[PDB]
Amino acid sequence: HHGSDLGKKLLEAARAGQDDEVRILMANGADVNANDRKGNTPLHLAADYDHLEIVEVLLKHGADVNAHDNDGSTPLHLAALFGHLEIVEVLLKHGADVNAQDKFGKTAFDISIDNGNEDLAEILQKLN
């Protein structure tokens, strides 16, 4: 809002896996729900880049578990696609919509199935 190149720095730190940079930027007010042009958030980004504690941090700082990039993909979608099982579990724990879906209509179960990730599926079945 009033000068989001903090948010840029944050998004960039979520990707890079820099956790102390993240911690700092939060302290500075940096927008936890900031968006790159492709519509990503930091959450999206650390899911993408397999950054577990970073996910855990951001979630703790009220990041949307169900934020949607431009194509509708959620961070769940990204962890699902990439086979980042643990990041998936915390996302779920934190209430990610298992049933949520991108603009192609793919939920995260669909993605598991389509990669044929036997384990991701069973973990996705396991909930209401």
């Binding site: 993408d48 194509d71 696609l81 990439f82 991108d102 192609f104 209509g105 793919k106 993605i111 389509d114």
Partner: protein, 98 residues
């Protein structure tokens, strides 16, 4: 397309009729065998026209399913190039820090 009424020079009042009544009779048979063949065709035509909404479907499904795949496939491609890059890092450190 038939013989017009009294194409005749000489008098053939009764035959003219009887004869025309007969050509008209068997022309009704002819036209009938045409309605038979037309409807019976129109029949095998409907079985064909029904495969349309189907192939229309099959197309639409696969067009969509494809877009979905490619969007994912691009995404993996990126991840692959990324992870490929990162190895080039770690190996490139095992020659330095060997």
């Amino acid at each position: 397309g038939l013989v017009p009424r009294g194409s005749h020079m000489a008098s053939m009042q009764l035959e003219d009729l009887r004869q025309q009544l007969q050509q008209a009779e068997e022309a009704l048979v002819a036209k009938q065998e045409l309605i038979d063949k037309l409807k019976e065709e129109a029949e095998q035509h409907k079985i064909v026209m029904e495969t349309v909404p189907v192939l229309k479907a099959q197309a639409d499904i696969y067009k969509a399913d494809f877009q979905a795949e490619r969007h994912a496939r691009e995404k993996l491609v990126e991840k692959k190039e990324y992870l490929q890059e990162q190895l080039e890092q770690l190996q490139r450190e095992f020659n330095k820090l060997k």
